[PDB]
Amino acid sequence: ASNFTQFVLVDNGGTGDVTVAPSNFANGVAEWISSNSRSQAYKVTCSVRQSSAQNRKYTIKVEVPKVATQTVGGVELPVAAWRSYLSMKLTIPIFATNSDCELIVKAMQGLLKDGNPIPSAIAANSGIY
Amino acid sequence: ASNFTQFVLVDNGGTGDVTVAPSNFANGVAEWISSNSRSQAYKVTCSVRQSSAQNRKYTIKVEVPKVATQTVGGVELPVAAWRSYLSMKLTIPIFATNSDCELIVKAMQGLLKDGNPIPSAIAANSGIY
Amino acid sequence: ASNFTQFVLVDNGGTGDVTVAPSNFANGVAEWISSNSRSQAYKVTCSVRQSSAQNRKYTIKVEVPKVATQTVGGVELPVAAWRSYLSMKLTIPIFATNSDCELIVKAMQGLLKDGNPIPSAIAANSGIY
Amino acid sequence: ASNFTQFVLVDNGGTGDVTVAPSNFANGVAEWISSNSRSQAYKVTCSVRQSSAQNRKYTIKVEVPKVATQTVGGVELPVAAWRSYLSMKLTIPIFATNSDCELIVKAMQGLLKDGNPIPSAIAANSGIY
Amino acid sequence: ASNFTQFVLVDNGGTGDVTVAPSNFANGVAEWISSNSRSQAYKVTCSVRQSSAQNRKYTIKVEVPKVATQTVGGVELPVAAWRSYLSMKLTIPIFATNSDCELIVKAMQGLLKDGNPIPSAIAANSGIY
Amino acid sequence: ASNFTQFVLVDNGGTGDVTVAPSNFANGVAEWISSNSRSQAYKVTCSVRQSSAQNRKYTIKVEVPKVATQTVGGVELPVAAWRSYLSMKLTIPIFATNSDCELIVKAMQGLLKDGNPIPSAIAANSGIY
RNA sequence: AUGAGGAUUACCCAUG
RNA sequence: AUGAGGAUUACCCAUG
RNA sequence: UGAGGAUUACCCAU
RNA sequence: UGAGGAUUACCCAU
């Protein structure tokens, strides 16, 4: 009926879960932010355009913040100490079938499944070796 | 330890699984590849470097073949019609701790969890609506 | 095999052991980094090149940080109060055989063995006397 | 006491042990030399000075010679076919306590411990891989 | 698990065998040298890059030395009287299957098998006639 | 003698063997070719000349067809997609004796022996790792 | 449009 | 990227 | 090469 | 400071 729904971005098992929701769709860019202060919210944006005459390009961005409380001018303001930025671009030929695309997805899911090299490395501040 | 081992990229539950294994490590850029012709194989590469003075940045690339009507081992042109290209860039501030990084991974896992918008959109040649 | 693996930089028995692992190997420069916040991690880089026509030259570099917590404006970040920098360059003629190198290595080990001058001096904020 | 004494630069058990002893200490530069013909002896020099207002800097230097006999015009002299030159500079902030230095030292010892990368690499005319 | 292992380059049946080992991997160039003095060692290097948009090019080099003992300045130095250089470049289309590549290998093995024209000629300082 | 005879280039053990035979000798450049259309045949050429004043240099070229999905006798374009090109250049100093040359051959044989890195890498569309 | 190019991340740089 | 082009072999030359 | 320097693969002198 | 150099307490670049 619509795919633009809220969804859980960080799953910690019922408690402390980071759920993100639709917040804007201006300029063809779907946005989702966490239920926080715009200054310290999690943000996910997605957009797709037909770049070439034969390709479609999905552009996804995610912002993970480190929440904090800065004291500017002697006043307490909610803020982000720093943000982590994920930026992925997916280019899919138009000849790709639905089944075809499903692979692209599954592949991406596998690439980050627990215990596999890449996420392992990332979660330990190291490279692959 | 050592994290540069083979893993399951596409999980179809036992049968039909696509395993990708290490194939190159020139320039600290790890490369995994499926057991197909380079022309039509699943490719995964990853590397890390300190982009600026405040950040480290993981660069991950994934190549996924179009399989529908594919001709195993054949020569199919144009190349741009039979391959999808994924390109992730993960920027993480030097202040991020191991825990911090685990969260960032979870966020990515969730972004792509089966059933959520982004992946289900890609999986249907759709955008957001 | 590979000699680009993790190893123990600091041996505290089996407790405070400081382990450094591969980071990246771009531009012929191997880099090892300890775990957790890059901001306050140990670093070890190594590289080898043919300096003259008769010599090869190793260039090792080690960084030992002083872990501390920077608090500014009520925002705390894990940082390094300061860092100690080791920088050694080793020149070895091409006429050196494996046997010769072993020797050179043993010399380096001796130079720093517990109880000897240079090491016991450095260890006490002292010089020679 | 004094830490300007003789020590073992190369430990061959109790046989080929290379012992280096005090030579002179002029201009704040300690020098150790092995016995016999200077022309083909081991050399070790060390010195410490206040580089900046916050740092002190050690400068160690080691010379490993390749003993050979030069015969020219029927006249033989004990000389060094060639020499291997080690040159290390260590910078330590003045805020470092004895405890801190011990650490820095242990790091150096580890860096060169048998079996680890850098040492085992140098020992085989090899680099990293 | 890894293909970068030591291997026997010249097989003389257990005795006098010339075995070569990994020695460096800087700049994406795998290197192997014999257990000799860098000045008179056997050397093998390999590297592969994706030259065209549709080709992959393996570049292999081998150095066979004639060991000797030169007397420079009246001193004995280990050295090579001369070196023999092998340089091969292999270009393989990306459409090449694994089975496809296997042929390329077998072909190369056959090309040099004992008793066949080419190696026969080489081993006798003559051309083909 | 006479060494310009047919030989087995690809040995599949009796059946499936690929024999290549002499087909041209213009300009002292010997050419062997398989029994296929020039378009999809195994080709081998070899020649020797004195490159410089100190060296002789064998130039060997090998062309190997892609067979997977090949259509026997058909016209398949583009040519660059169905063929692999090997190009060896062996430089040998004039001082090399027959024995010396035999060794050089052995070195080449070993470089490509079944099971060693280089050949097993090529055989798997892999590089070194 | 490409970039193991960058960020103060729906923007800036370089390139062909 | 090609060269029965070169070497003091991870470099130089010529060419299109 | 520098018992020149640091916010360390980078800056200052021959 | 220099993954600039050596005949190493000294030479070449910012």
From Swiss-Prot, chains A, B, C, D, E, F:
Subcellular location: Virion
Gene Ontology biological process terms in this record: negative regulation of viral translation; regulation of translation
Pfam family, one: Levi_coat
Source species of the chain: Escherichia phage MS2 (Bacteriophage MS2)
A cellular-component GO term for this protein: T=3 icosahedral viral capsid
Subunit structure: Homodimer. The capsid proteins form dimers that assemble by group of 5. Twelve such pentamers are linked together with free dimers. The homodimers binds to the viral RNA via an operator hairpin, but also to many other RNA sequences in the viral genome; this interaction probably shifts the virus from the replicative to the assembly phase and ensures specific encapsidation of the viral genome.
Record's keyword annotation contains RNA-binding: yes
A GO MF label: RNA binding
Name of the protein in question: Capsid protein
Family classification: Belongs to the Leviviricetes capsid protein family.
Protein role: Capsid protein self-assembles to form an icosahedral capsid with a T=3 symmetry, about 26 nm in diameter, and consisting of 89 capsid proteins dimers (178 capsid proteins). Involved in viral genome encapsidation through the interaction between a capsid protein dimer and the multiple packaging signals present in the RNA genome. The capsid also contains 1 copy of the A2 maturation protein.
